[PDB]
Design goal:
It is classed as dna binding protein/dna. This protein is 37% helix and 4% strand. By secondary structure, it is mainly alpha-helical. A two-stranded parallel sheet has the order 1-2. The longest helix has 13 residues. The chain binds a DNA duplex through helix 2, helix 3 and strand 2.
DNA sequence: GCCATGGCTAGTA
DNA sequence: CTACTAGCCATGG
């Protein structure tokens, strides 16, 4: 398959995530048949228009924190967002916004 | 072909 | 817990 089929399946995946639940970069890689594309799971997310109806904010790193998303602090945005779905998040000695994965993970 | 970038991740230690 | 490899693999130059 090819990179736009790929980008579509991933957005059908993500779209599936129940409000107020979450999933992992890596899991979706797996779910769409692409067990080793976790990194490109990241970039599909990275490219969305900021219009999108796709819940990119329900996607996190497989330790259950929010990805440092380097280029600058902006992914404040992801947390402020997941808290809008009553998800609970706390913090690390050292930044790492973070959560209870087993509680919020979407296990379908 | 190269390289340097990255919303990644099991392993290690 | 935190760091650190080692793999992974598309992009854009």
């Amino acid at each position: 398959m090819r990179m736009d089929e790929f980008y579509t399946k991933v957005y059908d995946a993500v779209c599936e995530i129940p409000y107020g639940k979450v999933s992992t970069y890596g899991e979706i890689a797996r779910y769409v048949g692409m067990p080793s594309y976790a990194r490109q799971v990241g970039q599909a997310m990275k490219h969305l228009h900021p219009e999108t109806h796709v819940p990119w904010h329900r996607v996190i790193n497989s330790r259950g924190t929010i990805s440092k998303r380097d280029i600058s602090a902006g992914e404040q945005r992801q947390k402020d967002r997941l808290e809008e779905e009553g998800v609970e998040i706390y913090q690390t000695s050292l930044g790492e916004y973070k959560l209870n994965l087993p509680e919020y993970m979407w296990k379908p």
